[PDB]
């Protein structure tokens, strides 16, 4: 086990193990959902619940 | 598979392209009950139209 920069001290440490993202994240492919409507607006149950 | 089809609400038209599709290709038989078609009966003459 080790200090933990922060929970320890103050050494401002210059050197880390940043994690990062392989590659850009948020290249096209955006999700797209199709939408059906009811084909009546008067057999809706609603009720329940 | 022998599949009923009575509120043939939702289901998208992505979903029908496939089992109708599929009917074919599996033998599947879909059977459809809110249709409402009247029915002639012409002869082998005037063949379809």
Known sequence: ?49 | VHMTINERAGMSKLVADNIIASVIKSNWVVDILDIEYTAEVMTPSEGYT
């Open chain 1, 1 to 49: 086990q080790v200090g933990i920069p922060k929970l320890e001290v103050d050494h401002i440490s210059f050197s880390n193990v940043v994690s990062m993202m392989t590659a850009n994240i948020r290249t096209g492919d955006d999700m797209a959902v199709e939408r059906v409507n009811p084909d009546d607006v008067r057999a809706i149950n609603i009720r329940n619940a």
